[PDB]
C-alpha cells in the first residue's frame, strides 16, 4: 500500500528507544524525513546512528529536548522548522503512588505539568504550521509508559481521559484544514520500560520476571505481548495520506485487552 | 420513599443560588443538617435566611469560601467538622475563549487550577472523615456552568472528562468503606447562569433572549428546559441510604440531550 | 421524598420472585396499583397473596402470561387496560458461550425472547402513555442471575441492542413525558443468582462458597447487592421525581463498572 | 507499506458496487485472490469483468448468493473452499423510523437480515481461519448509504448488537490469530448514498444539493468521504500489519463522531 509519505517531515517525540524509535524507523521506511528527540543524549545518538545507517537516503535531525518543558518544546519546533521548512507529522509520545488519599495538590499539578500539558503545548505549536500547509497528522500515544494496563493506574487514567477528549476537540476544529488528529492506546507492548517494569514487579512480591510475564499473558486474549513494530504499523497508517478521512478517534492496539 | 437522611450532615458547594441552592433545600427537606458556602457573602446570606425560615428544625452553617482556593477549602472542611463532628455528604458544584490555537500553557494551567483540582482537593479532604464514619456520599456536578451543552466547549470538555475518570478511580478505592461517589451531568437547566447566558448570546448575534431559548428548546428531545428541582431530586437520591449499591457512575440529567 | 406515585398503575413483568417481586413491593409501598405476571400460576399466586396481604389498600391484578409470546403479551396489556383504564409504568424484567457452537436457530431463538419481548411490550404501552402525557418505562438489562462477564455472548448482544433501543425510543417519546431508561444490575442476591452459584459450582467442580468468594473480589464494595437496593433505583426512575431523566442506562453494581 | 497480503484469499460480500467493490479492488491490488458475490447476476458480472481485466494475475471467483439466506451463505463458503482450500479474510458488507409503527414482523425481519447474516458468515469462516492460525474479519457497520442520524432506529439496534458481537468473538478467537474488528462509515460517496439523496430530497420536497449541503455542515472535514478512503482502512485491518488489533470498532467519518 502506497502511504503517500515520500518527503513528508515527521517529528517523533520519545524516539530514542521503544515505541518511538520503531515509529521513526517505519516512517523513514515509507520515505519520511525525520526529527527525533529525547532527553538522553547518549541513547538518542545510538538511535540516530542506527536510523542514519538503515536509511542513508533519508534526512534525520536529532535534537536533545525535554518535551515536558515549555522552552525546550518551543525551541524543538523552531529548530525543526528552520531545518525543513515544514512539519507534516507529529507523534506525541512521552512519559508511582497509586492511592487517592496520598495524592496532594502539588502531586496532581505536577502530573498535569507533564504529559498532559506537554501534548497540548506541542499540538498548539505545530497547528499553525500544519494549517498553513493544509496538511498535518498528529498521533497521540495515550498509554501507561510500560506499566501493565489497569484501572488501578489513577494518575494516568485522569490524564489519558483528558487527552482523549482534547483529541476530539482539536480534531473537530482543525478538520477543515486537513490537519487530522487521532490517538492510539497501547496494550502490553514489549518495550524497555515494560521489561524494566517486569523486573520491578518481580521484586515487590518475591518472584521472577518470567513469572510476572506469565501472569500478564493470561490477561491478554491473544496470549501474546505486542511488538513495537505491530504498534508502529498503526501509527504510520494514521500518519499517512491513506488515513485522509480518519480524525478525532482513539484506537486501542492491545491484543484484545479492551474486549 | 424514606431516604434515610435524618441528621446526616451535607456540605453543598455553590449553594447560594441555582442548582446548589435547590440541592441544599431538598437535603434539608429530607432531614439533613447543612453546610452551605460560596464567595458572595450577600447572596449566601439570602440563601441562608431562606433555608433557615423554610426549615427551622434543621441546623444550617453558612461559610464564605472560595472552593477553588486551597486555604479556603481546607478551612471549610475544618470549620464544618468543628461544628458537626461529621461530614456525611459532599456535593461538588463549582464553576470564555473556545478556539484551541488561542489557548496558552497559562490558560490551560489556569483551567486545571479551578474546578478540576477544586473537586479533587475537596474530595481528598473529606475522604478520611467519611472513611472513619464508614459512611459517605460524594456527588460531583460535572456540567458547563449554565452554557448550552456543546462539544464546542473545549475547556470544560477536557476538565469534565478528567473528572468523570477521577470519579471512577476514587469510587473503586473507597467502595470498601461505604463511601460512594458518583457524578451527574446536567443538560439545560433553568438557573441564574443559564438566564445570564441567554442575555449574552442574544446580544452576540442581534436577537432576543426568547429567540435564543427557542433555538435551545429545539435541541432537547423533551422540548423543555429542566428545573433545578428536577436536577436536585437525582442528587438527593444519590446522596441517600437508598443508593447504597450505586458508585462510580456518571448520570446525564438532560431531557434526552444524550440521545 | 415524595415520589408522586399515589394511584399510578404499574406493570412489572417477571414479578413472581427476585428483582421483579421486590420492585412490585416497593411500587405498592409508594402507592401504586399493580399488574404482576409470570408463566407459572402457582408461583404467581404465592407472589399475589404476599403482596395483597402486605398492601390490602392497593389494587393488584395478577395475570398468567408468557411475555416472550406475542399473543400473551397483547392480551396482558388489553386485560390491564380493561381493569385500570391506564398503564403509567412498565418495568421490563424477563429472563435473560462458545461462538462456534451457536447456530442460527440459537441466535434467532435468543432474539425472539427478551429482545423482541421488551420491544413488543414497549410498543404496546407507548400509545397508552403518550395519550396520558405521562409514562415511565424501565428496562432491566442484566444476565438473569449469572455473574457478569465478557464470556456471556448472547446476553451481551441482546443487552447492547436493548441499550440502543432505549436511547432511540427515549428520543422519540420525550415530548410526551414518556420517559425510558435502563438499569444494568451487577451481582444481586436473588433466588436465580443462588441457583446459578449451585450450577456453576457443580460444572466447575468446586463449591458455591468458592464461586461467591471469587465474585466478591471483583466487586469494589466487596459485597453482593440486595433486591431492595436494586428496586430503589427502579422506583426512583419510575417516579415523578425523575421527570428530566430519559434515554440513559444506569449500572447498579457496587462499583463493578469501575473495577 | 508491505501489508503481507500476497496470495491471501479474501471474501468480500456486497462487492458488486460501492464500498464492497472498492474494497475488493484494493485487496486485489495488494495481491489477494478474491471471492466476490451479490444477489444480482448482471451487476455481479459487471464487477467481475472490471476486476478480472484490472487484475488478470489474480484469481477472482464470483458467486451469485443472497448472504441474508442460510442456504446461500453456507453454499458460498463451501464453493469458496472448494476453489481455494482456504479463506483468510472475510469482509462482512451487506445491506442495512417511527417506533410505534414498527411491528414484531418488522423487527424479526430486521434481525433475520444483516444481524444474523454477519453472525452466520462469521460462524462459517471461524473454523477455517482457526485451523490456519490466521484470519481477519472486518464488519462494515453502517447505515447502507443513509446519512447517519439518531432517527435510524432499526439500524442503530442492529449495529449496537454487531459491535458487541465483534468484541465477544474477538476475545474468543484472539489466541488463534483470527482478528475481528468493525468499521463504522460516516458519509461516503457511493451509488447507494447518491440514491438516498434523491429519495430523501423527493420525500422532503427539496433538492439533493440542499440535502448534501445540510450533511456537509455536520461533517468537520466539510466533505463526503470516498470509497477509496474507506477501503484503505479495511485493507489495513485485513493485513498482516494489523496483527495486534482486535475487538475494536473504528469510525471512518471525517470527524462526525467528534462533531
CA-based nearest residue to C168, from C236, C240, C119, C128 = C119
Q: Which of residues 229-258 of D touch C (CB under 8 A)?
A: none
CA-based nearest residue to C253, from C95, C141, C135 = C141
Whole-angstrom Cα distance, residue C126 to residue C136? 10
Q: How many residues does chain D have?
A: 259
Judged by CB atoms closer than 8 Å, whether chains meet at A99 and B173 is answered as yes
Whole-angstrom Cα distance, residue B150 to residue B187? 10
Whole-angstrom Cα distance, residue D48 to residue D63? 10
B126, closest residue in chain A (CA to CA)? A101
Whole-angstrom Cα distance, residue C151 to residue A221? 12
Whole-angstrom Cα distance, residue D89 to residue D181? 12
Judged by CB atoms closer than 8 Å, whether chains meet at B168 and A159 is answered as no
Where are chain C's structural domains? 1-259
Question: Which of A158, A160, A175 is best to mutate for the B interface (most B CBs within 10 A)?
Answer: A158
**What is the DSSP-derived secondary structure letter of residue D62?**
E
* Chain centroid offset of residue A212 CA: 25
Which residues of chain C neighbour B246 with C-beta distances below 8 Å?
233, 250, 252-253
* Chain centroid offset of residue B38 CA: 12
Q: Quote the cell numbers at residue C156.
A: 451481551
Burial (0-12, 13-18, 19+ Cβ within 10 Å), A67: buried
Cα A199 to Cα A189, A193, A213, B124, C99: the distances in Å are: 15, 10, 10, 32, 38
Beta-strand pair C178-185/C249-252: parallel
CA-based nearest residue to D54, from D27, D76, D93 = D27
Edge-to-edge strands of the sheet including D60-64?
D60-64, D33-38, D9-12, D89-92, D135-140, D178-185, D249-252
Strand partners, A9: A33
Centre a 10 Å sphere on the Cβ of residue A6 and count the other Cβ atoms it contains.
Answer: 11
Cα A1 to Cα D6, D12, D56: the distances in Å are: 12, 19, 19
Whole-angstrom Cα distance, residue B239 to residue B241? 7
Cα angle value B152/B158/B164 (rounded, 5°): 120
Q: How far is A194 from chain B (nearest CA, A)?
A: 23
Which helix or strand (DSSP H or E) is residue C81 part of? helix C70-84
Judged by CB atoms closer than 8 Å, whether chains meet at B165 and A161 is answered as yes
Centre a 10 Å sphere on the Cβ of residue B227 and count the other Cβ atoms it contains.
Answer: 16
B175 touches chain A (CB under 8 A): no
CA-based nearest residue to D1, from D243, D182, D245, D239 = D239
CA-based nearest residue to B234, from B249, B219, B221, B222 = B249
| Contact yes or no for D253/D187 (Cβ under 8 A) | yes
Q: How far is C164 from chain B (nearest CA, A)?
A: 9
3-class secondary structure, C221: coil
- For chains C and D, what is the number of CB pairs under 8 angstroms? 93
Whole-angstrom Cα distance, residue D169 to residue C99? 7
Dihedral angle, C-alpha A10, A249, D155, C71, nearest 10 °: 150
Q: How far is B105 from chain A (nearest CA, A)?
A: 7
Residue with cell 429542566: B226
Which residues of chain D neighbour B259 with C-beta distances below 8 Å?
150
Whole-angstrom Cα distance, residue B152 to residue D118? 37
Q: Quote the cell numbers at residue C259.
A: 473495577
What contacts C54, CB < 8 A, 6 or more positions away? C25, C28
Judged by CB atoms closer than 8 Å, whether chains meet at B165 and A166 is answered as no
| Contact yes or no for C117/C94 (Cβ under 8 A) | yes
C119 touches chain D (CB under 8 A): yes
The method recorded for this entry reads X-ray
Whole-angstrom Cα distance, residue C45 to residue A97? 57
Residue with cell 486537513: A178
C-alpha neighbours within 13 Å on the C-beta side of residue A70: 6
Which residues of chain B neighbour A165 with C-beta distances below 8 Å?
157-158, 160-162
**Exposure string (b/e) for B105-118, b if CB count within 10 Å is 16 or more?**
eeebeebbbebbbb
Judged by CB atoms closer than 8 Å, whether chains meet at B173 and A113 is answered as no
3-class secondary structure, C140: strand
Q: How far is C168 from chain B (nearest CA, A)?
A: 7
Q: How far is A134 from chain D (nearest CA, A)?
A: 12
Whole-angstrom Cα distance, residue B51 to residue C240? 24
Instruction: Show the beta-strand stretches assigned E in chain B.
Output: 9-12, 33-38, 60-64, 89-92, 136-141, 179-186, 250-253
Burial (0-12, 13-18, 19+ Cβ within 10 Å), B69: middle
Which helix or strand (DSSP H or E) is residue A141 part of? strand A136-141
Whole-angstrom Cα distance, residue C41 to residue C32? 23
D125, closest residue in chain C (CA to CA)? C100
Whole-angstrom Cα distance, residue B209 to residue B200? 9
Cα angle value A14/A15/A17 (rounded, 5°): 100
| Contact yes or no for B259/C170 (Cβ under 8 A) | yes
| Contact yes or no for A187/A149 (Cβ under 8 A) | yes
Cα angle value D194/A177/A89 (rounded, 5°): 115
| Contact yes or no for B184/B195 (Cβ under 8 A) | no
What contacts D6, CB < 8 A, 6 or more positions away? D30, D31
C112 touches chain A (CB under 8 A): no
- For chains B and D, what is the number of CB pairs under 8 angstroms? 3
Q: How far is C23 from chain B (nearest CA, A)?
A: 13
By Cβ distance, the residue of D98, D123, D156 closest to C100 is D123
CA-based nearest residue to D228, from D49, D44, D19 = D19
Q: How far is D11 from chain B (nearest CA, A)?
A: 36
Whole-angstrom Cα distance, residue C236 to residue C242? 7
Cited resolution, angstroms: 1.4
Whole-angstrom Cα distance, residue B174 to residue B247? 10
Backbone angles phi, psi at C93, to 5 degrees: -145, 90
A150, closest residue in chain C (CA to CA)? C259
Backbone angles phi, psi at D183, to 5 degrees: -125, 130
By Cβ distance, the residue of A104, A127, A165 closest to B101 is A127
Judged by CB atoms closer than 8 Å, whether chains meet at B245 and C229 is answered as yes
The terminus-to-terminus CA distance of chain C in angstroms comes to 31
Whole-angstrom Cα distance, residue B17 to residue B40? 10
Whole-angstrom Cα distance, residue A102 to residue A62? 39
Q: How far is C210 from chain A (nearest CA, A)?
A: 21
| Contact yes or no for C108/C164 (Cβ under 8 A) | no
The terminus-to-terminus CA distance of chain D in angstroms comes to 31
In this structure, which long-range contacts are made by residues D111-116, counting pairs with CB atoms below 8 Å and at least 24 apart in sequence? Answer: D111/C108, D111/C111, D111/C115, D111/C116, D111/D158, D112/C108, D112/D68, D113/D68, D113/D158, D114/D68, D114/D158, D114/D162, D115/C111, D115/D158, D115/D161, D115/D162, D116/C104, D116/C107, D116/C108, D116/C111, D116/D68
* Chain centroid offset of residue C151 CA: 22
Which residues of chain A neighbour C220 with C-beta distances below 8 Å?
none
B259, closest residue in chain D (CA to CA)? D150
| Contact yes or no for A161/B162 (Cβ under 8 A) | yes
| Span C1-259 CATH architecture | 3-Layer(aba) Sandwich (3.40)
Which residues of chain A neighbour D189 with C-beta distances below 8 Å?
none
Which residues of chain A neighbour D220 with C-beta distances below 8 Å?
171-173, 175-176, 247-248
B182, closest residue in chain C (CA to CA)? C255
What contacts D200, CB < 8 A, 6 or more positions away? D147, D211
Q: How far is C139 from chain A (nearest CA, A)?
A: 24
Which residues of chain D neighbour C98 with C-beta distances below 8 Å?
172
Residue with cell 491471501: D8
Q: Which of residues 123-162 of C touch A (CB under 8 A)?
A: 150
Strand partners, C249: C182
Helix, strand, coil percentages in chain A from 3-state DSSP, rounded to 5 = 50, 15, 35
C123, closest residue in chain D (CA to CA)? D100
C166, closest residue in chain B (CA to CA)? B259
Which residues of chain D neighbour A177 with C-beta distances below 8 Å?
none
Amino acid at each position: 500500500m502506497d502511504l503517500g509519505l515520500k518527503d513528508k517531515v515527521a517529528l517523533i517525540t520519545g524516539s530514542s528507544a521503544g515505541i518511538g524509535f520503531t515509529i521513526a524507523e517505519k516512517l523513514a521506511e515509507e520515505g519520511c524525513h525525520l526529527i527525533i528527540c529525547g532527553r538522553n543524549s547518549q541513547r538518542l545518538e545510538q538511535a540516530y546512528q542506527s536510523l542514519a545507517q538503515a536509511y542513508p537516503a533519508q534526512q534525520i535531525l536529532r535534537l536533545v529536548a525535554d518535551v515536558h518543558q515549555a522552552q525546550d518544546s518551543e525551541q524543538l519546533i523552531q529548530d525543526s522548522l528552520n531545518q525543513y521548512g515544514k512539519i507534516d507529522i507529529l507523534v506525541n509520545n512521552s512519559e508511582a503512588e497509586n492511592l487517592i488519599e496520598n495524592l496532594s495538590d502539588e502531586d496532581w499539578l505536577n502530573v498535569f505539568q507533564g504529559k498532559l500539558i506537554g501534548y497540548i503545548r506541542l499540538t498548539n505549536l505545530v497547528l499553525p504550521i500544519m494549517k498553513k500547509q493544509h496538511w498535518g497528522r498528529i498521533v497521540n500515544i495515550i498509554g501507561t509508559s510500560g506499566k501493565e494496563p489497569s484501572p488501578r493506574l489513577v494518575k494516568s487514567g485522569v490524564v489519558n481521559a483528558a487527552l482523549m477528549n482534547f483529541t476530539k476537540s482539536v480534531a473537530r476544529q482543525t478538520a477543515p484544514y486537513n490537519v487530522l488528529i487521532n490517538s492510539v492506546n497501547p496494550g502490553v507492548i514489549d518495550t524497555p520500560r515494560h521489561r524494566e517494569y517486569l523486573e520491578i514487579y518481580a521484586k515487590k512480591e518475591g518472584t521472577t520476571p518470567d513469572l510476572i510475564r506469565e501472569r500478564i499473558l493470561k490477561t491478554i486474549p491473544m496470549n501474546r505481548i505486542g511488538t513495537t513494530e505491530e504498534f508502529a504499523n498503526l501509527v504510520v497508517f494514521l500518519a499517512s495520506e491513506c488515513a485522509s478521512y480518519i480524525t478525532g478517534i482513539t484506537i486501542p492496539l492491545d491484543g484484545g485487552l479492551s474486549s
